[PDB]
Design a protein around this ligand. Structure first.
Ligand SMILES: [Cl-]
Ligand SMILES: [N+]
Length: 177
């Protein structure tokens, strides 16, 4: 139940994600991400792109059907008024790419949490262009303490939940449509 590990998919829940948050300690902005793979395919880590912030965790390399990966991120350490924003990319054994955006801002006077999930045709690494697509162009979900569902095409669908504060949990389930 640590970031960088995989757990049985059925075990994923907000308690495990709070555990992940608690392990990062006293930092101002941080995120715990759990993504439950119920897609019928194996996922292999590609990379994480950070627009800002960092993780000390390696993406779980192999995520079999029926497993959830756990991951985390935090703001850059130090007197920088910035949050943690980035895109995770996994390659799926059908030849496509699962991409996940998470965005936790510094200033909640003016900005809000967001996330997004998309499947890309072919093998595509996470990068600043992918961030811009996920954030500006592909209808991200607000981290509004609510669940959101969307078909992903490719026979899959996504259902996820993110809270609205600067200690963020993001729980996503990828299932057969
Ligand atoms: Cl915003
Ligand atoms: N601080």
């Amino acid at each position: 139940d640590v970031a960088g590990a995989v757990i049985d998919g059925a075990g994923l829940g907000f308690d495990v994600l709070k555990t992940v948050l608690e392990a990062l300690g006293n930092v101002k902005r941080k995120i715990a991400v759990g993504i439950d793979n119920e897609s019928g395919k194996t996922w292999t880590a590609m990379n994480t792109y950070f627009r800002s912030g960092t993780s000390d965790i390696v993406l779980p390399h192999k995520v079999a059907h029926g497993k959830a990966l756990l991951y985390n991120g935090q703001k850059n350490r130090g007197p920088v008024a910035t949050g943690v924003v980035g895109v995770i990319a996994y390659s799926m054994s059908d030849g496509n790419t699962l991409a996940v955006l998470f965005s936790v801002p510094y200033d909640y006077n003016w900005y809000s949490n967001w996330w997004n999930v998309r499947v890309y045709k072919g093998q595509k690494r996470a990068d600043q262009r992918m961030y811009e697509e996920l954030y500006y162009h592909r209808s991200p979900f607000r981290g509004d303490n609510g669940w959101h569902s969307r078909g992903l095409g490719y026979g899959l669908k996504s259902r996820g939940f993110m809270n609205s504060s600067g200690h963020a949990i993001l729980e996503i389930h990828v299932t057969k449509a």
